[PDB]
Amino acid sequence: LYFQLEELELDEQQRKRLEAFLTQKQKVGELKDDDFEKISELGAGNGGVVFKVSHKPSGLVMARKLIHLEIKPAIRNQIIRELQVLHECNSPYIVGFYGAFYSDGEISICMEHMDGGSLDQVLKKAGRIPEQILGKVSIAVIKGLTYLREKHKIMHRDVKPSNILVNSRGEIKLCDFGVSGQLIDSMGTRSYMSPERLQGTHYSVQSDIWSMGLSLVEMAVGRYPIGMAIFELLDYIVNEPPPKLPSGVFSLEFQDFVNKCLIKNPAERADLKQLMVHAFIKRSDAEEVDFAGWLCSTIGLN
Ligand SMILES: Nc1ncnc2c1ncn2[C@@H]1O[C@H](COP(=O)(O)OP(=O)(O)NP(=O)(O)O)[C@@H](O)[C@H]1O
Ligand SMILES: O=C(c1cccnc1)c1cc2ccccc2[nH]1
Numbered sequence: 111l112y113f114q115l116e117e118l119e120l121d122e123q124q125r126k127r128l129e130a131f132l133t134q135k136q137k138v139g140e141l142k143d144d145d146f147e148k149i150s151e152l153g154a155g156n157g158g159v160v161f162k163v164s165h166k167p168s169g170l171v172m173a174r175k176l177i178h179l180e181i182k183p184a185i186r187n188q189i190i191r192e193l194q195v196l197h198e199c200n201s202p203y204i205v206g207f208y209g210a211f212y213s214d215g216e217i218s219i220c221m222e223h224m225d226g227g228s229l230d231q232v233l234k235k236a237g238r239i240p241e242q243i244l245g246k247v248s249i250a251v252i253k254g255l256t257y258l259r260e261k262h263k264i265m266h267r268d269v270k271p272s273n274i275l276v277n278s279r280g281e282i283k284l285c286d287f288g289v290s291g292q293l294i295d296s297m298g299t300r301s302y303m304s305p306e307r308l309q310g311t312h313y314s315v316q317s318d319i320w321s322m323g324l325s326l327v328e329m330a331v332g333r334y335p336i337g338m339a340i341f342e343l344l345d346y347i348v349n350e351p352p353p354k355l356p357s358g359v360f361s362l363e364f365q366d367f368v369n370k371c372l373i374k375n376p377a378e379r380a381d382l383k384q385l386m387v388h389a390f391i392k393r394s395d396a397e398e399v400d401f402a403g404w405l406c407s408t409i410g411l412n
């Protein structure tokens with residue numbers, strides 16, 4: 111393999127892991143519905159269902175997300191085409207992608223299986239996720255959001271605990287980002303949308319910062335921090351002060367970090383550059399946290 115990795119400043123462990131995923135990916139060609147065998151259901155959301163599958167020609171275990179869309183063939187083919195950009199989205203903070211295709215009213219998004227599942231699944235087991243672990247989560251989310259914005263000019267548009275994937279090797283990765291404009295166009299009791307997004311305001315990385323901040327407070331406290339009825343919830347986000355991390359249990363740097371993510375005004379709200387040099391991030395990056403060890407003990411893995 112003739113790797114074109116230099117654009118990413120990677121540690122040797124990150125370089126080895128990314129190279130091992132890309133090498134495994136070389137076993138995979140054209141994806142067909144007939145070449146998959148359903149192992150189990152990993153989970154489901156509003157738009158689709160994701161299954162742990164076996165890709166029979168390669169032997170690879172994958173996570174197959176199926177999104178039901180029986181629409182005009184010309185527009186589903188535009189979607190499938192827009193999804194091919196995912197082949198170029200190589201980052202330690204972005205879930206690996208094997209391929210995307212359409213079959214029998216379903217668009218399939220085949221990706222790297224993350225054996226730790228999502229952070230909302232681990233939150234159920236953990237109760238509360240430790241501040242120090244959330245420091246590593248914060249770094250991975252900022253770096254992933256930065257990679258997407260800087261390298262592919264894409265915004266996530268759907269940052270939430272269920273869209274942050276973890277594994278037994280201690281990797282933290284984003285998934286379900288807005289790579290396809292046509293998929294967004296063609297496509298509850300909890301909302302992670304920024305107050306300005308809920309009012310109609312054009313999307314921005316600032317909205318992703320809000321979603322990240324809210325997700326952090328939820329994971330830190332063990333529950334959705336607003337609270338409930340639909341309008342009641344959205345009226346609270348738009349017209350009431352943002353939620354705050356409780357005092358006496360969390361560091362001042364972590365409280366200040368989430369406060370800067372949750373500023374109602376998107377202009378005063380912190381950007382990715384400012385968040386990357388925030389005391390919380392600087393502290394968290396210097397800490398030796400055995401995230402892989404903590405994850406394997408709280409959810410019972412390797
Ligand atoms: N690559 C993956 N590896 C392992 N588990 C995964 C993977 N992708 C998704 N999952 C799991 O599948 C569950 C359901 O996924 P999904 O249908 O995207 O629901 P959602 O994240 O709650 N909604 P949304 O992203 O807004 O469409 C997630 O909560 C994850 O736990
Ligand atoms: O559902 C989408 C999606 C949403 C809006 C626009 N384009 C795509 C998606 C799934 C997915 C899995 C991995 C990486 C990126 C991903 N994006």
Ligand SMILES: [Mg+2]
Nearest residue numbers: 155272273286
């Ligand atoms: Mg998701």
